[PDB]
Every structure is written in C-alpha cells, then in structure tokens.
Write a protein that binds this DNA or RNA. Structure first.
Lengths: 137, 197, 171, 87, 191, 36
RNA sequence: UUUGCUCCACACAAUAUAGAUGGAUACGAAUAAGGCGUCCUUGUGGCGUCGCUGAACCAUAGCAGGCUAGCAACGGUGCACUUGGCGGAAAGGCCUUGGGUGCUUGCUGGCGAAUUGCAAUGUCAUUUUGCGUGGGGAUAAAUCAUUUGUAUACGACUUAGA
RNA sequence: GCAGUCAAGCGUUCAUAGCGACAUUGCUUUUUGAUUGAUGUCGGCUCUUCCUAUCAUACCGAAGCAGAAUUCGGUAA
RNA sequence: AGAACUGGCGAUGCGGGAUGAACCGAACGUAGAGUUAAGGUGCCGGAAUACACGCUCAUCAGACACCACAAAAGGUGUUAGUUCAUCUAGACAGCCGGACGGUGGCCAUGGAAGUCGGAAUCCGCUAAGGAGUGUGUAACAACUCACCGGCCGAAUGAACUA
C-alpha cells in the first residue's frame, strides 16, 4: 500500500512499425506502415497490401492508429509486405470499432431508397420489441 | 440547422467567436451566447487590461454622456466585439443584431437546452500551448463589473441541479443500452446490421 | 516551386581557328528549363566574363534521384548575398531526394535569412554516407536506435461551424 | 467652479430623498431598522459641558446650534423581499 | 535546439509515496502530506518503479526545458519536507530597546507579535502561516525557530518577519536592529 | 494605472509622399557621392 | 356612456410576417487528458472499452394520410381531466399518479383514390385586430377648474376639498 | 569648434590608395577665492481643459546618510 | 540649385491603394454572357479561419511609405550560421586539496610583511604556485584567483555574421 502511483498517458508513438491511416490524397482511407522517421513531421511510409506507394509523407496527412508490429528500420517493400502478412495487420484493423465505424458509414452511404424504407420498417419492429422489454424490466 | 443555436462561450477566443457569430447572424441564424464570463482573450492579463484602460480613457471631452459608453460586463464586451464586425448603422445590420442574445451564466430557459461550441474559435484548438491568455470574468471585475460573485453562485447551483439530471440520464441510458443488448441476436437485428443499422 | 535538377553543359561560341572550347558543366535546381538556362548563364558570367551571346548551351538533361525513396542525410554547401557581403553556409538536411532537400533549403533561407532564389547559389549537395560524419544536432538527433516520440495535443479539423461536443486533443 | 460630483444640478425627482445605501448587514445581531422618518422642526441652541481630552475646551462649556426633528413612531404596514440577480 | 525529448529524474526514498494525476502531486511521507498544483506547467510524469519518477518534455523550447528542472526541484523539495522537514533559525538584535517577541492569538489565528522595535509604540503582527510552528530557542539569546514541512511556507514566514522590522529613515550602518535569518537547516540533523 | 497616449500607426499621405521624396533624393545623392 | 369592461369556447372577417416546412436532442471539468462499464481493500484505485466527427440519435409507411375485418401484446403515443412534487437568473417549465377516451405501421387481410389532364408555393405556420354567438367574472380613477407654499419664469412640484 | 594623437572598426581584400566610434594641448586667463538685464506690440486679469520634462504633498534607492537638516535619483499629474 | 531628354497632368470618366492633384491597373456608344488586370479572400465585404516549411510574444508588437529619418550602438531574449579554440594520455560547471623558498625584495613612512605609495618585476624547486586578482588587519594573520591535482563522466567555450 506504500506504492507510488503516477498516471501514464497512452500516446500513440511515431516509430518504425506503427500503422497509420491516410486521410488525404490518392490513398485516403488506406493503411500504411511507418518505415522510417525523416524528421519531426515527415515519415517514410509504405502500404504494399492496400496499394499505397512508398513515399515521404507529412504526419499531417495521416492519423496514427493503435497498431504496431516489428519492422526493421528502412525495410524495403517486399519485407514490409512479409512482416505485414505475418503480423496480420489487416485482420487487427478489421477487428476494431474504428474500422467497423468506417465500414458502417460506407454501407449507409451505399444504401438505396428501397433499402432505407426497409431499414425504417425493421427499426419500427425492433423498437416495438425493445420498448416492450424495457417496460417489462 | 436548428431554429436557435446556443453557444457555450466558455473556452472561446473573443474575436474568432465574434467573427463566426457575425457571419451567422447576417446569414439569418438566431444565436444565443451563454457564459460570456468564461470567454478567453489571447495575451497577458496585464496587456488586455491595458487595452481596456485605453478604451476607458477615450471619451467625448465636452460632454461625457455623449462619448463612447464603456460597458464593463463580459456579455457587453463580447457584444462590442460583435457590433464592430456588423454594419450596425443600417437596417440590415440592425436586423442582424436583433437575432443575437448574449448572457452571463446560463439562465432559464437555455439551462435545459443543448449547448454547442465553435471549434474554429476554441482556445484549446487554436492557441499554442504555453501562450498566456486572459479570462473575461477577471478582466471585467478588474475594470469594474460587479456581479462576478452572484453569477458564480448561481452557476454553482445550476451545476448541482445539472449533475443530478445527468445522473438520472446516465441510469436510463444504461437501462436502454441493456435492453438493446438483449436484442442483438434477433433476425431484425441481423438484417439491420446487414443494412448498416 | 516544385524543384527539378538539371545538368547543363555549355561552351564558348565556336569561331575560326578556335576549336574545342572549355565544356563548362553545372547542376541547376529550378522549376523549369527556361529558369535553369537563365541561371546557368548568370552563374557562367559570374564565374568568368562569358556573355550569353559569347556562349552556347550544348546540353541540358533532367537528373532523377537514383533511389528516390531512401532516406538520406545530405550536406549542402551554399553561398548567398545580402546587404552585407556574400556569406558561405553549411547545412544538414535529412530527406529522400536532392530536390526535396534543395526546396527545404530554399524555404529555410527565406524564413531565416530573408534570402531568395536569386540570392542563393547551391555549391554542393552530397549524401553523408556515415552517421558519425554529421555535425548539426537537429539532424544527429533523429539517428538514435529505436527512436520513438509522441504527438501531444492533436488538433482535429472540423468541417462544420458548430460541434455538439467538446473536442479532445488526445492522440 | 463647483463640485463636479453633484452634477447635474437638476431638481430632485421627489420631495422625499432616497436612501441609496443601507448599513452592511450582520446576521448575528438582533433585528433592527436601519433608518427612520421624521419632519424637520426648526433649530435652537444648547450649552454642552464638554469632556474631550486633548482639546483646549476639555472640561469647559460650549454653545452649539442643534436641529430638532419631530419623530412620532412609524407604522409598519408591509414587507418586501429582494433576490440578487446578475442584474 | 528544439530537442525531441528532455528528461529529469526524481528519486523517492523508502518511506514516502508520491501520487500524480493530471499534474496534481501529493507527497505523503513519515511527517505528513504535501500537495502541489502544477497544471501551469506542461510536462509528462512517468514511473518505472517505486524509487524513481521521470519528468519529460517533448519537443520543447528553451523556456519549456527551463521549467522542467524547476518542476523536478519543487517535487524534490516536497519529498525533503515530508521526510526531514525544514527549520529556520532567526535572531533578533538591538542596541537600546529590547525587541519583545510573542506568540499571540488574535481572531482565532496565530500571530507573531513584535513590540518595542527601536522604541516604537506600534505593535507589529505577522500572521503564522498554516503548517509552520513557531518556537523560542532554549539556552540561546533572542532566537526564534520556524519549523515546517513546506519550505515555501517556512521561508516566506521568515521573510515576512524580517521585512516587518525594517529600519526607516535612518543609517543602516549605525542602526543594526532587526530580525535576521541566522540559519537554515532541517528538522533532523543526525550528523 | 493612468494609461498614457499611444502613437498612431495611421500613416498620413503627406508623410508617406515626403518619405518617398526623401528616399529618391537619398538614392540620387548616393550615386553622386559614389561617383565623387 | 342606450349591456359599457374583462377571461374562456366556436365562427367568420380583416392584419402582416428581416422569413416554420420532422426534432434547439440539457452533466461538469481537463486537454502533457478524458467518457462509459465492471470490481474491490473505496481511492489521484484495478481491469475492460470508446473517440479518430452530428456522416450521429430519435423520429420517420397510411386521402397532407380515408373507411373497415382480424392476430399478437398489455407495450408506444395523443387529448380532455386528476395525484404528488420540483424549479425565482429572465422561475412561466420539468417530472410524476390514477382512471377515461382515441390511434397504433408489431403482423395478416378487404374496399377508396383517376379528370389538378406532362410542372406551376399549389395555399396545411403563427402575430394582432374586429364582428357574432354561450360560459363565467369585477363594479374605478385621472385631468382641468378651485385651493396650499416645504415649489415655482411658463410648464412642472407639493398640499386640501362631498 | 579648430588642428591634431593612435586606433574599435571600416574602406572593391589592400594599415601611411582613404576613411573612421569611443578616449587625451589652447580659449574669455589669470591662480592662493581680488570686484568684473533685455524686451514695445505686446502685457495684463479671469477662467476651462490637457501634458509631465514633478516645485510641494505620498512611497522608495543611494551617499560619512550618527541625530537633525540636506544632496542625487526612481514610481507618481 | 542650373541645363537637356522623356513621360504623367491640363481637355479624362472607369477598377484598385479605407480616404486623396501627380500611386498601381485601364482609357469610355447601348446591352447580354464569359475571362481577366491591379488589388484582395476572419468579419465589416464578393472571394480558402486553404495547403506547406520556418521565425516572432512587444508594460500600448506588426500588418509601410525602406535598398529613408530617429540608426551609432545597447540586451544574461530567441533562432540559424562563420572562424578560432580546449577535450576520455578527461572538455565546461562544481566540491575537496596544493597555491612553495630568498622574501618581511628595493626606497621614502609611526607602522605598510603580495594588496595607501614610485622603478625593473628577478632567482630556485616545481603537476603547479604573480616579487600578486580582491576582500580583509594599525601591521600581521585568514580567505581568495592566477595556476596544478583527485573526484564523476561528455562535449564545452570565445569572438564575429544574419
């Protein structure tokens, strides 16, 4: 009970192996791996699975994700692909609430007018059942 | 898109908020600003106080009741910054200014409405960390505003009531979340999730 | 602009009883070939009194970066003019290409010494092969094993005028 | 000329002058009126036997002008409550 | 040079516990508890063990790194005050009029009352800050001892006592009367 | 807290054009004295 | 002053609108930090989870939304009443009780729509002011003129008079 | 101010092609401490306001400032 | 200031420079559509609170006439450079040690021993130690720094330029 407590911050770190999401440009909405750190504001990323070309990019163009994997500094594209597949980064991404929220946004954008009608009908039915349950409990 | 937009003025930079509000009012949106005593100004308190004292010395020499009226309250300081950004001597400018209300604290009826923020005017998003800044309540009290304590006591009472309301809302939200978690396995749930809902 | 690197080879104007002039070559960083040729004539005259009419450009090629996606430490030797005399400067720039490093240098010169493109002359750009040969600490700092740093105080972009929640600057 | 704090030199809005500041309250004390109403009824002169140490007129008698204010007791006929507001 | 990261160490002895949350620092040792609100500084606190705490500044400038060492030294002072305390000894001297120093209780609070300074009829009152205790030295002439966990409180109390007895409109070469901080040490002085 | 008067940064046309003439004269004299 | 004045309901007029056209949808504080859930030895605690925009959430099918037959459930919601509180910052609103009365698109059926002619805001909101009905309610002052002088250029002020 | 004296530095790099910051003869001038006012078309009063480059009042700093009195300075209209 | 040339204005509206004799665009019939100049794009106010790399925090910044006057410099503000330097056969900063002998050198002084005064400032031993960098005594003494060593480990200092 005589242990000191210092609250820590779970900052995402700019580091080799960190997974980033590109938010502006040709490869917006695609994942890439930070391969090298050019300076405070530029990193060399590489996104071979999703098709992102190997490039120098400002950290303002990407958002750091909570994903990391072991990657040698300065690794070439095939090595990045090998480490990426081995670490199963696409599965880790698809298994998260962030990527699922993106997928839901895209699907809702893709819905047809008939399908929005169907969504309304199903929401009314589910609502009926849930209000009944809420009143019961 | 709301008929009335209520901005919680806490943690906003005075001029950027004033610019935003002026454009919205001229474009035809009703705006209520609350908690004007919690607005920020970038720069040191001594610097902003000096600027106010320069404003204070400006007055009509032969009749002071004609000169610039130096309003001390935070809501009025914000209103001055806004009127400077409206063309207030025209009928259009007067109609724009008729679409605005500014308050200290959050009085009724706005204390039970939704409050929004203006991100392009937020101090935490705009000012660089380490830059000194001034708070409008302290500036107003130093220059002669006399209701800082009354507003603070009323705001404490409002916060107590609001915390009780939020506790009840949190309980109801938990109950509804459970009622929806019991229905995640149904056919309608699967169909809705397939459609994205 | 967006810089390109041009090799420019010129010579004296051929005349009678005058064969084989001194083939002067240079590497010019410029947005296009017209600016590169003008800069070549200017530098040629500064090096030696050879007017544009007294010379002739026999070749100009664009030089692409050999390994454009390899991170390289560059040493850049330059000299620039001001109200005071010309000054010589050495700078270290960590980037993936010479044109990127040269653009960075031009922007840094404008920001620091108020100098411009017409005032800067790029004497040499060379990759520093060994880590130990670097001098500037703002470059040597990014060369440590297992470098990691956070990005505190993330400011998110807002598309709409009003937000319905207070923003968090977490990252 | 004149004291600029007593501007403007205009007629008082009423014949009864307003009390614009009452004594600061102290809740521990018993309930008391802060003020009273009377009618001015002339002046006169008194002889006061002064006890004021340090003065040249200590232990000596002086003549003072005084004002007499006719004060029959007042009748209490109402009460008003005040709430403090940001205004 | 705009360093990427700068760090300072804060050692924690075997008896004290440090709690840090949102830059509020509570230090609890054998002798009590101190609390410091450091939200006016921009630093990050971490710990690897119960004996060492790191304070770090990321991508800071000259003023930021200047504040970093200050934060470390303030937490060090809190640790020292909670483990060994502070004891400031002051001596008052006079030529003719003996300075009279007492602890009085006025309006339910502790005051150091100074009487007959240079023959003054004026009573001087120095409020005793909370957390610092005032004593009078045994077998020593004209010595007052201020002891506390907070070095800030003790040093400011001693400064207030020294300044309250300033000599006005005289020669400080000739008139040496006053209360002076004789010594500054800790409440434990084993060696 | 008696804040004193502050110098105006609003430039007058007369001063602006006078400064322009001063600069022209300065340059012409610089050329002449460099010749001499 | 020939039922004058005022508050309710329907019933038609006139009025003019700085500008309805699903919903202004309520913690506080911090941002070098937080929200939510769970647990304990109850705190500056342990673990889990969330953000990366409201792109949300709720509403949302029916002559601009008619008339009917059932099924399942006893939920959702409106209206006129009623119970018990709470809110004074500009409270003028929030929550709750009980019964009655409708609707229900949670599910299955049955009739109607056309001709506004291939579009025309195609009229559905709410301010005020009047007139008519039936449901109630309450029965004053001020000014001039006269008068006082604590007032006064005139006004104004201040007294008095069944 | 005059002539200088060297130069901190500078001058298209150039020490006496040439400049040049800051610092050092003589002046009404003789020593022992003797005798050796301008303004005429401006000026009065009253009286308002403003500046501070503060005479007094307030608070401070220094000085052989013992005390007393004073000197120099800082904030201050 | 005296000349000579060439422009602008005069007889001249229009866009811009908030405003305007000599500034920046552009010269003019009445209209429609498109594109632009100069100048701009937080709001006033049409148009990016665009994107990017740097710098700056002013106790009345700056947003310009500038290859102009206050302007020669001052600053323990901040950034980037040039040339000198010292450094793991140990740098900078700190603690602790040493800091010696003729000798209290020589002249005037009541006294003056490195330190009220005037002249070369010497010789030996030294890792190293001035016939002394300051405080300090009546003279001493004591401390001190010049310089060298131990301590731990890593780059540090000076002068200039912008």
């Amino acid at each position: 009970s005589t242990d000191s407590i210092v609250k820590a911050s779970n900052w995402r770190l700019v580091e080799v192996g960190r997974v980033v999401l590109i938010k502006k440009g040709q490869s917006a909405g695609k994942l890439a791996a930070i391969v090298e750190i050019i300076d405070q504001k530029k990193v060399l990323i590489d996104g071979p699975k999703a098709g992102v070309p190997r490039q120098a990019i400002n950290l303002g163009q990407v958002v750091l994700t909570p994903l990391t994997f072991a990657l040698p500094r300065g690794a070439r594209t095939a090595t990045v692909s090998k480490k990426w597949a081995a670490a199963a980064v696409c599965e880790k991404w698809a298994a998260s609430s962030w990527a699922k929220k993106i997928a839901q946004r895209e699907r809702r954008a893709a819905l047809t007018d008939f399908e929005r009608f169907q969504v309304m009908v199903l929401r009314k039915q589910k609502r009926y059942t849930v209000k009944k349950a809420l009143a019961k409990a | 898109v709301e008929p009335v937009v209520v901005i919680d003025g806490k943690g906003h930079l005075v001029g950027r908020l004033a610019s935003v509000v002026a454009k919205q009012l001229l474009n035809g949106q009703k705006i209520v600003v609350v908690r004007a005593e919690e607005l920020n100004i970038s720069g040191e308190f001594f610097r902003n106080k000096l600027k106010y004292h320069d404003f204070l010395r400006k007055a009509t020499a032969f009749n002071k009741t004609r000169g610039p009226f130096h309003f001390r309250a935070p809501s009025r300081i914000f209103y001055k910054a806004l009127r400077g950004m409206v063309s207030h001597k025209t009928a259009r400018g007067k109609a724009a200014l008729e679409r605005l209300k500014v308050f200290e604290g959050i009085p009724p009826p706005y204390d039970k409405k939704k409050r929004v923020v203006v991100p392009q005017a937020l101090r935490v998003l705009r000012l660089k960390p380490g830059r000194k800044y001034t708070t409008l309540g302290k500036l107003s009290t130093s220059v002669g505003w006399k209701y800082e304590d009354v507003v603070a006591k009323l705001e404490a009472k409002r916060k107590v009531s609001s915390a009780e309301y939020y506790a009840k809302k949190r309980a109801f939200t938990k109950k509804v979340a459970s009622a929806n978690a019991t229905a995640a396995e149904s056919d309608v749930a699967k169909q809705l999730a397939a459609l994205g809902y | 602009a967006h810089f390109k690197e041009y090799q420019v080879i010129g010579r004296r104007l051929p005349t009678e009883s005058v064969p084989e002039p001194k083939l002067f070559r240079m590497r010019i960083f410029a947005s296009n070939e017209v600016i590169a040729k003008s800069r070549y004539w200017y530098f040629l005259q500064k090096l030696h009194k050879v007017k544009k009419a007294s010379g002739e450009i026999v070749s100009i090629n664009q030089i692409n970066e050999a390994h454009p996606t390899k991170v390289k430490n560059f040493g850049v030797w330059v000299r620039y003019d001001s109200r005071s005399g010309t000054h010589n400067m050495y700078k270290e720039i960590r980037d993936v290409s010479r044109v990127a490093a040269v653009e960075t240098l031009y922007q840094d010169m404008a920001a620091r010494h108020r100098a411009r493109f017409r005032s800067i002359h790029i004497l040499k750009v060379a990759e520093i092969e060994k880590t130990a040969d670097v001098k500037r600490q703002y470059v040597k700092q990014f060369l440590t094993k297992d470098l990691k740093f956070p990005l505190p105080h993330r400011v998110q972009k807002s598309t709409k005028t009003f937000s319905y929640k207070r923003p968090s600057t977490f990252y | 000329h004149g004291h600029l704090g007593f501007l403007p030199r205009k007629r008082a809005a009423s014949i009864r002058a307003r009390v614009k500041a009452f004594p600061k309250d102290d809740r521990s004390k018993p309930v008391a009126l802060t003020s009273f109403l009377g009618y001015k009824a002339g002046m006169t002169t008194i002889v006061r036997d002064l006890d004021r140490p340090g003065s040249k007129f200590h232990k000596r008698e002086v003549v003072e002008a005084v004002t007499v204010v006719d004060t029959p007791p007042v009748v209490v006929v109402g009460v008003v409550g005040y709430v403090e507001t940001p205004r | 040079m705009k360093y990427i990261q700068t760090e300072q160490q804060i050692e924690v002895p075997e008896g004290v516990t440090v709690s840090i949350k949102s830059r509020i620092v509570k230090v609890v040792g054998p002798r009590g508890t101190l609390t410091k609100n450091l939200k006016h500084i921009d630093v990050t606190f971490t710990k690897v063990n119960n004996q060492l705490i790191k304070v770090a500044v990321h991508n800071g400038g000259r003023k930021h790194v200047a504040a970093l060492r200050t934060v470390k030294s303030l937490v060090d002072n809190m640790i020292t005050g909670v483990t060994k305390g502070y004891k400031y000894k002051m001596r008052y001297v006079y030529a003719h009029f003996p300075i009279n120093v007492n602890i009085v209780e006025k309006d339910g609070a502790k005051f150091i009352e100074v009487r007959n300074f240079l023959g003054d009829k004026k009573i001087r009152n120095v409020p005793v800050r909370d957390g610092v205790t005032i004593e009078f030295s045994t077998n020593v002439k004209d010595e007052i001892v201020l002891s506390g966990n907070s070095v800030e409180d003790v040093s400011q109390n001693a400064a207030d006592l020294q300044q309250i007895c300033r000599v006005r409109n005289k020669d400080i070469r000739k008139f040496l009367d006053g209360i002076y901080v004789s010594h500054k040490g800790f409440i434990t002085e084993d060696l | 807290m008696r804040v004193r008067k502050r110098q105006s940064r609003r430039t007058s046309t007369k001063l602006k054009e006078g400064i322009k003439k001063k600069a022209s004269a300065h340059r012409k004299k610089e050329k002449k004295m460099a010749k001499k």
